Write a protein that binds this ligand. Structure first.
Ligand SMILES: [Zn+2]
Ligand SMILES: [Zn+2]
Lengths: 40, 40
């Protein structure tokens, strides 16, 4: 199991969410959050 | 353009992010955030 956004595996990250087919880890969610909130 | 997670269109949401092929809107990012932070 790997993150469909950054490729990291189930082990390399804290949590891995299940999507329609994809996989989003906690790191990419934090990132998408910054992207959307337009903040760093 | 639609959100690969909730199907809403480019117009129905505030922002639409571009992924490797998918599209994640602000609403689904907030959701994924709750899922990961395990909070409501
Ligand atoms: Zn990731
Ligand atoms: Zn969505």
């Amino acid at each position: 199991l790997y993150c469909s956004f950054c490729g990291k595996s189930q082990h390399e990250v804290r949590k891995l969410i299940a999507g329609p087919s994809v996989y989003i880890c906690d790191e990419c969610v934090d990132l998408m959050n910054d992207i959307i909130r337009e903040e760093i």
